[PDB]
Scaffold this active site. Structure first.
Site, PDB file in Angstrom:
ATOM      1  N   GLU A 189     -12.100   2.938 -17.179  1.00 16.06           N
ATOM      2  CA  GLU A 189     -11.267   1.993 -16.531  1.00 16.06           C
ATOM      3  C   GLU A 189     -10.173   1.484 -17.400  1.00 16.06           C
ATOM      4  O   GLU A 189      -9.043   1.311 -16.979  1.00 16.06           O
ATOM      5  CB  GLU A 189     -12.092   0.820 -16.046  1.00 16.06           C
ATOM      6  CG  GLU A 189     -12.994   1.132 -14.863  1.00 16.06           C
ATOM      7  CD  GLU A 189     -12.264   1.615 -13.616  1.00 16.06           C
ATOM      8  OE1 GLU A 189     -11.029   1.627 -13.620  1.00 16.06           O
ATOM      9  OE2 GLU A 189     -12.980   2.066 -12.702  1.00 16.06           O
TER      10      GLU A 189
ATOM     11  N   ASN B 177      -2.346  -1.027  -8.412  1.00 18.07           N
ATOM     12  CA  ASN B 177      -2.777  -0.087  -7.396  1.00 18.07           C
ATOM     13  C   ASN B 177      -1.705   0.172  -6.443  1.00 18.07           C
ATOM     14  O   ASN B 177      -0.864  -0.637  -6.251  1.00 18.07           O
ATOM     15  CB  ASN B 177      -3.937  -0.689  -6.718  1.00 18.07           C
ATOM     16  CG  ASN B 177      -5.050  -0.904  -7.662  1.00 18.07           C
ATOM     17  OD1 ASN B 177      -5.279  -0.011  -8.493  1.00 18.07           O
ATOM     18  ND2 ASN B 177      -5.681  -2.041  -7.645  1.00 18.07           N
TER      19      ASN B 177
ATOM     20  N   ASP C 285      -1.758   0.060  -3.407  1.00 19.32           N
ATOM     21  CA  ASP C 285      -1.782  -0.960  -2.367  1.00 19.32           C
ATOM     22  C   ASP C 285      -1.173  -2.307  -2.725  1.00 19.32           C
ATOM     23  O   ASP C 285      -1.139  -3.186  -1.879  1.00 19.32           O
ATOM     24  CB  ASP C 285      -3.186  -1.138  -1.831  1.00 19.32           C
ATOM     25  CG  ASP C 285      -4.102  -1.804  -2.783  1.00 19.32           C
ATOM     26  OD1 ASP C 285      -3.668  -2.150  -3.883  1.00 19.32           O
ATOM     27  OD2 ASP C 285      -5.254  -2.057  -2.440  1.00 19.32           O
TER      28      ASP C 285
ATOM     29  N   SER D  24      -2.337  -4.264  -5.073  1.00 24.24           N
ATOM     30  CA  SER D  24      -3.294  -5.035  -5.803  1.00 24.24           C
ATOM     31  C   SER D  24      -3.145  -4.564  -7.255  1.00 24.24           C
ATOM     32  O   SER D  24      -2.475  -3.576  -7.538  1.00 24.24           O
ATOM     33  CB  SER D  24      -4.672  -4.801  -5.286  1.00 24.24           C
ATOM     34  OG  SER D  24      -5.066  -3.466  -5.464  1.00 24.24           O
TER      35      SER D  24
ATOM     36  N   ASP E 231      -5.540  -3.969 -10.837  1.00 23.53           N
ATOM     37  CA  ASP E 231      -6.814  -4.045 -11.485  1.00 23.53           C
ATOM     38  C   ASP E 231      -6.644  -4.627 -12.831  1.00 23.53           C
ATOM     39  O   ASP E 231      -5.713  -4.287 -13.571  1.00 23.53           O
ATOM     40  CB  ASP E 231      -7.350  -2.651 -11.649  1.00 23.53           C
ATOM     41  CG  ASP E 231      -7.753  -2.015 -10.364  1.00 23.53           C
ATOM     42  OD1 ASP E 231      -7.834  -2.684  -9.374  1.00 23.53           O
ATOM     43  OD2 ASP E 231      -7.987  -0.774 -10.373  1.00 23.53           O
TER      44      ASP E 231
ATOM     45  N   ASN F 239     -10.233  -5.502  -9.279  1.00 23.27           N
ATOM     46  CA  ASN F 239      -9.119  -5.433  -8.372  1.00 23.27           C
ATOM     47  C   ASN F 239      -8.831  -6.812  -7.805  1.00 23.27           C
ATOM     48  O   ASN F 239      -9.753  -7.485  -7.389  1.00 23.27           O
ATOM     49  CB  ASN F 239      -9.491  -4.438  -7.274  1.00 23.27           C
ATOM     50  CG  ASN F 239      -8.304  -3.911  -6.547  1.00 23.27           C
ATOM     51  OD1 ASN F 239      -7.309  -4.536  -6.559  1.00 23.27           O
ATOM     52  ND2 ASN F 239      -8.400  -2.725  -5.956  1.00 23.27           N
TER      53      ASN F 239
HETATM   54 CS   LIG Z   1      -8.030   1.258 -12.568  1.00 13.55          CS
HETATM   55 CS   LIG Z   2      -5.438   1.298 -10.680  1.00 11.97          CS
HETATM   56 CS   LIG Z   3      -7.371   2.115  -9.025  1.00 13.99          CS
END
Ligand SMILES: [Cs+]
Ligand SMILES: [Cs+]
Ligand SMILES: [Cs+]
Ligand SMILES: [Cl-]
Ligand SMILES: [Cl-]
Ligand SMILES: [Cl-]
Ligand SMILES: [Cl-]
Ligand SMILES: [Cs+]
Ligand SMILES: [Cs+]
Ligand SMILES: [Cs+]
Ligand SMILES: [Cs+]
Ligand SMILES: [Cs+]
Ligand SMILES: [Cs+]
Ligand SMILES: [Cs+]
Ligand SMILES: [Cs+]
Ligand SMILES: [Cs+]
Ligand SMILES: [Cs+]
Ligand SMILES: [Cs+]
Ligand SMILES: [Cs+]
Ligand SMILES: [Cs+]
Length: 129
Positions: free
Chosen positions: A35, A46, A48, A50, A52, A59
């Site tokens: 991650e 993201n 979208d 959002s 992270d 998120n």
């Molecule tokens: Cs991520």
């Molecule tokens: Cs991401």
């Molecule tokens: Cs992601």
């Protein structure tokens, strides 16, 4: 903070992640690795809208509030920025909620894609803990 592997394992263990929801520490470390590369400050937008945040790339659509993610539920009741702290408590606390949310660590797509089923113990191999 960029954790070392064992350092993070230890901190995760310290924060009760080890075998939390039955996910061994290696899973969490592995998740963190892919991650955030153990970087507490990792942020990644993201598609979208959002973002992270943090070691576990929590998120802001669901879990933390970043103030720019329309729909944010902020289910960890935490500003996403708190997920960037050198202290992983908030990330861990929130990851505990995420991993409890029903899909286990599959919540972390990178966990699913890169950790799940793998020798996650490797991640803590050599760690004192
Ligand atoms: Cs991520
Ligand atoms: Cs991401
Ligand atoms: Cs992601
Ligand atoms: Cl590593
Ligand atoms: Cl493990
Ligand atoms: Cl928001
Ligand atoms: Cl599970
Ligand atoms: Cs635990
Ligand atoms: Cs344990
Ligand atoms: Cs990236
Ligand atoms: Cs991105
Ligand atoms: Cs969700
Ligand atoms: Cs908000
Ligand atoms: Cs919101
Ligand atoms: Cs909330
Ligand atoms: Cs909280
Ligand atoms: Cs749920
Ligand atoms: Cs879910
Ligand atoms: Cs997800
Ligand atoms: Cs496998």
């Amino acid at each position: 903070k960029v954790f070392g592997r064992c350092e993070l394992a230890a901190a995760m263990k310290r924060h009760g992640l080890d075998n939390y929801r039955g996910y061994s520490l290696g899973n969490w470390v592995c998740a963190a690795k892919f991650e955030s590369n153990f970087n507490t400050q990792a942020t990644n937008r993201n598609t979208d809208g959002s973002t992270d945040y943090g070691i576990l790339q929590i998120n802001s659509r669901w879990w933390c509030n970043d103030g720019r993610t329309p729909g944010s539920r902020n289910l960890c009741n935490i500003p996403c920025s708190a997920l960037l702290s050198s202290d992983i408590t908030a990330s861990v606390n929130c990851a505990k909620k995420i991993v409890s949310d029903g899909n286990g660590m599959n919540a972390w797509v990178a966990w699913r894609n890169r950790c799940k089923g793998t020798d996650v113990q490797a991640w803590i191999r050599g760690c004192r803990l």
